[PDB]
Structures are given as C-alpha cells and as structure tokens.
C-alpha cells in the first residue's frame, strides 16, 4: 500500500554547559541502503540564541521547521519580541501534540541559552512531551552517545572524584570524539559533521570531517 | 466483573451491590459505592466498563432531577426506565457506544415497587429480581429457590445474606464487602453493610 513514514537516519547531540549550549548533527541523508546526498544539515536556526535539530523523517523535518519558523513570526508580530527558549519548547509541545492522531515522526532537540544566560536543552518526543536536561541525543546513534556522556559529563560510577562543570574547551573535543566513535560503528552517521555552538555572543558553525564510507 | 443484585418485596425493593473498584490485578478502592440515587424513591445501579458507568449514569441523574424541578413532581419508576433506554439505545449506532448494565429500583405511590433490568444493548425488562456480572450466575439460582412475593423485609435481608455469602465460596473474585439499601413508602433507607472480614 502506502507507507507515509521512512527513516532517513540522522543523529543529533546537545550539551548544555554553564555559558554555552552545543547542538551538533551529521549531514548524511539516506533512505534505505542508499545515500541521497552527503550534505543535509539537520541543525536549523530559529532565533539568535536558539538552534533546533530535527532527526527523523526528512519530509516532516522540513515541514515542522517551516511551521515553527512561521509561528516564531506569529509570536514576534503579536508579542513584539522573540520567543524564549522555554516558550519554543512549550509551543512546539502543543504543535507536535495537535498531530496526536497522525503524529510527526521526528526527534526534536532544542538548545540554547535561557533568560538566565545558562545552557538549556529541551529534548522532545514525537508526541510532544518535553523535559530539560544537561545533555541529550537523538536519532539512530542516540543509544551510542548517551553512555559516553553519563561518564564524562555526569562523573557517574566513579567514587571520590571532583565535579567540575564542563568547559567549552572540553566540550568541543567531547562532541567531535563521540561522533568519530559513532560514525564508525553506525551506518547512518558520517560523511561530515556540523557543530553549531550557541553562546551569549552568537552562533558559530564548525564543520568536521568524518569517515566517508 | 462487578456484581449487582435486587429484590422486590410487596412494600419494598431491596437492592445490594459490591463495593469493590478493581483495576488490573489489584483492588484500588474497596468502599466504592455503585448505588446512584436518581430521585427520592428511585435508585439506579450501574456496572460495566469503568468509564462508561459513571459517565452515563450521571447523564440520567441530571435529567431525572431536572424533570422534577420543571413539572414539580418526580418521574415515576416506569417513565425513568424507558428514558434511560432510549438514551442508551441511541448511543449504540453512533460513534460513542456505551457498555453498561443497569438496575432501576424504585417505589411509587400508585404502581408500587418496581425493579428494572437493562443490558448494554438497551433492552429494558421489568423483573421481580435481577443481577449483573459473573456473580449473577451463582446468585439468581439462589433467588429462584427462596423468593416469594409475600416475603418480608426481615426475611429479605436474611435471604440476601444467603446469596451474598455464596460469592465468597465459589466465586473467584474477592468481593469482601457488600452495600445494601432498601426502599419503602418512607423513601430510601440504608441497611447495615454486609461485611466478611
């Protein structure tokens, strides 16, 4: 018959530091065993302080992004100000939920800085539940990324070790290395990397090379 | 499945029900009262799907209370039975089917005592005694044996205790405590709750 949803792969990783929030994703867009194109950025920009990733069916990633960017302007025109990171989460929770009976298949991870200037990451589900966390992942490689962060970021399972808040200098090499580890062992990840770092100054996009196979 | 019962005496209607509210493998609420009072002398007993019982039987309780305020006199137990049917019947073919099982028990100044049976397909029946649930198979047999139209309240409660204590032996579900109420010319009257500690 007709199968409306296909899995296009993709991987999203967010880390909320004290002064920074990093949202990174790969470029590979692939349906089935074939690669359509090796540049398809998952990271999309909403406001200056907010970057949203979309991991899932690519047609919903394109539609949902145009719906969000439409309601950013509906808010900015009505309220004469940009949406806060917490407001984008609460809105997109109701946007994803209005589809409850024919859901969007996507994994949204919103990250950036809140009113306090601190990294705020909101991870969603296709049905629109959301909760704040220091680090989240998504997509096919989400299962590989999370255990690595529980150790380095969370200092779990280690007795008598000091807890130092993660530094951007260690966060850059932490995001790059988990993908170098994930792109190897995952077939849906590779061919390139985009890191969009959200600080108080602005968004800085950094591209990293990954295994091409 | 939850359990209902009713008995019609000459001057009275003696109804009883189980107080258990159960979900999955556990009993959530053991004091849950399934007896809904439509009017002064008119009761109602609803069991079925957990959500459809309270949702539907409250639509009736308001239409009955509304009728008494409009015309100044309450419905008779006969009219209240045929009204609950048509609502439950119209909801069958629509997109919101109700699954319920009703007992309408009432007393009337003229018609006297009345007891009505109803299934989830809204087929109304007026019987001297009736029961619902899986406990209706282990009980109505006992009611067949000991029931008489001349029975007295004193015997009825004693007769009701013979039925309800046999759900503790054969019937698999717990059902520790049973609520009991009686209706007469003086209105509804509560009776000592049958309890098997």
């Amino acid at each position: 018959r007709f199968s409306p949803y296909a899995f296009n792969g993709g991987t999203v990783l967010a880390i909320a530091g004290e002064d920074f929030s990093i949202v990174a994703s790969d470029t590979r867009l692939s349906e089935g065993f074939s690669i359509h194109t090796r540049d398809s950025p998952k990271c999309y920009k909403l406001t200056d302080k907010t970057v949203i990733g979309c991991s899932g069916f690519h047609g919903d990633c394109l539609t949902l992004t145009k719906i969000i960017e439409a309601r950013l302007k509906m808010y900015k025109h009505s309220n004469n100000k940009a949406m806060t990171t917490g407001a984008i989460a609460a809105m997109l929770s109701t946007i994803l939920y209005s589809r409850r009976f024919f859901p969007y298949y996507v994994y949204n991870i919103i990250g950036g800085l809140d009113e306090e200037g601190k990294g705020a990451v909101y991870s969603f589900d296709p049905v629109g539940s959301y909760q704040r966390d220091s680090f989240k992942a998504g997509g096919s490689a989400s299962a590989m990324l999370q255990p690595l962060l529980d150790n380095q970021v969370g200092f779990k399972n280690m007795q008598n070790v000091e807890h130092v808040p993660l530094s951007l200098d260690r966060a850059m090499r932490l995001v790059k290395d988990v993908f170098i580890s994930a792109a190897e062992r995952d077939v849906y990840t590779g061919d390139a990397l985009k890191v969009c770092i959200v600080t108080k100054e602005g968004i800085r996009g950094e591209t990293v090379p990954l295994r091409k196979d | 499945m939850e359990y209902l019962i009713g008995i019609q005496g000459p001057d009275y209607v003696l109804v009883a029900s189980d107080r258990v509210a159960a979900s999955n493998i556990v009993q959530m609420k053991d004091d849950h009262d399934k007896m809904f009072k439509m009017s002064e002398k008119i009761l109602l007993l609803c069991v079925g799907e957990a959500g459809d019982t309270v949702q539907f039987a409250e639509y009736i309780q308001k239409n009955v209370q509304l009728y008494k305020m409009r015309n100044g006199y309450e419905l008779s137990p006969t009219a209240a039975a045929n009204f609950t049917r048509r609502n439950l019947a119209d909801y069958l073919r629509s997109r919101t089917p109700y699954h319920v099982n009703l007992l309408l028990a009432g007393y009337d100044e003229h018609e006297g005592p009345a007891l009505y049976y109803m299934d989830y397909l809204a087929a109304l029946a007026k019987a001297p005694f009736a029961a619902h649930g899986y406990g209706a198979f282990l009980t109505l047999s006992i009611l067949d044996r000991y029931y008489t139209p001349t029975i007295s309240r004193e015997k009825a409660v004693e007769l009701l205790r013979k039925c309800l204590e046999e759900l503790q032996k054969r019937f698999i579900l717990n059902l520790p405590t049973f609520s009991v109420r009686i209706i007469d010319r003086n209105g509804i009257h509560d009776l000592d709750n049958i309890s098997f500690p």
Binding site: M144, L145, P147, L148, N157, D177, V178, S181 | -
Partner: protein, 204 residues
C-alpha cells in the same frame, strides 16, 4: 525481540598480555526482576572463559553443551583447548541449529596456551565467527557498549587498566539499559593469575 526477554549484557576487551570479560548479574522476566545471582560468564578452564547473553534458557543450555564438548575434547587431546579452536566449536554448535537457532550471542575471551597470546571473538544466532583485535559485545544494550568501548579502548594495556576500562564500560552502558543491571561481575585473565571482582552497581 525474543533475545530481549531476559535482557543481559556481556563484554570482552583485549589488553596487551591479558584479556577481561564482564557481564551483569541481573536475571528477570521482561519488566520483573527475580534474582541478582545469575551467572552469565562460565569457566572453560585455566585462562579461558566464555560469556553468554540473550534468552536465559539458552545461556544455560548452550553452556552445558560446551562443557560437555570441551571435556570430551580435553580428554581426547593431550592438551588444553586453544581459544581459537573453541570459537569454531561454538560456531559449529550454533550452526547445526540454523533452522531452530538457540537465542544467544556467545562472547569468547582467553589466552592462547602457547605463551602469552590473547584472543577474543563474538558470534551470532547462526554462529558466524568474528575475530576482532579490540573488543566484542553482545546483549540487548549492545548499542550502548559500542560507544563506550570505542572511546576507552587502546591498543596495549596492562591488567590494571583493563579492569578500570571494562568496569566503567559496563557500569555506564548498563545504567541506560532498562532490562540489565543489578551489579556487574568482571573477570581478569592474566598470564600469572586470574582476578575476579564483583562491582557495586546501582540497584534498579
């Protein structure tokens, strides 16, 4: 799937002259725990172990067949089994079942009895032998254990560092798995001796 009924995790990482194999202690049926004493790692004799994961029936069923076939092999031969030969045994054991396969993914770790030579490998339901120079994992959490072992593993490590590496590899990978947990047992195979340690892990 079916191998996700009882959950479970098995890991093996190769060092320089030594190997280490680890598995969790949890035995449960779907969402319900039963006991924490379950044993997923079995001795094949001196300096050779084998882990087993997947359905808990086949863990004990396949293991009792190996000690059956191993003890026959070790009594016929005048020597102990080589870890490379044992890989082909378990591969032949699982492949004869091709059309009614055991549900399990054996993980073999040990030392070549010759002198120092370490060996590890992993298998599948059908028993395709797979030899790796770094690590092997099997279980429902396998996806977790890849990322942990990728970053932590190094070409040559002394025994002290294997334990620290494989400990944090299991503990962190299991915490994100729902059906695995309840403590981890870690074995260390050296040339001189064998060190067994049961870690204190989150009970959940």
């Amino acid at each position: 799937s079916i191998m996700s009924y009882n959950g479970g995790a098995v890991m093996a990482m190769k060092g320089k002259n030594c190997v280490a194999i680890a598995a969790d202690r949890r035995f449960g049926i779907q969402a319900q725990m039963v006991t924490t004493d379950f044993q997923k790692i079995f001795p094949m004799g001196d300096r050779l172990y084998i882990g087993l994961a997947g359905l808990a029936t086949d863990v004990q069923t396949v293991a009792q067949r190996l000690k059956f076939r191993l003890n026959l092999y070790e009594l016929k031969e005048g020597r102990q089994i080589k870890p490379y030969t044992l890989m082909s045994m378990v591969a032949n054991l699982l492949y004869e079942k091709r059309f009614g396969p055991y549900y399990t993914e054996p993980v073999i770790a040990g030392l070549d009895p010759k002198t120092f030579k370490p060996f590890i490998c992993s298998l599948d339901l059908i028993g395709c032998p797979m030899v790796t120079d770094d690590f092997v994992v099997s279980g429902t959490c396998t996806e977790q254990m890849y990322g942990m072992c990728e970053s932590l593993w190094e070409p040559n490590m002394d025994p002290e560092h294997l334990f620290e590496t494989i400990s944090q590899a299991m503990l962190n990978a299991v915490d994100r798995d729902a059906v695995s947990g309840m403590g981890v047992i870690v074995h260390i195979i050296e040339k001189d001796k064998i060190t067994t340690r049961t870690l204190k892990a989150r009970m959940d």
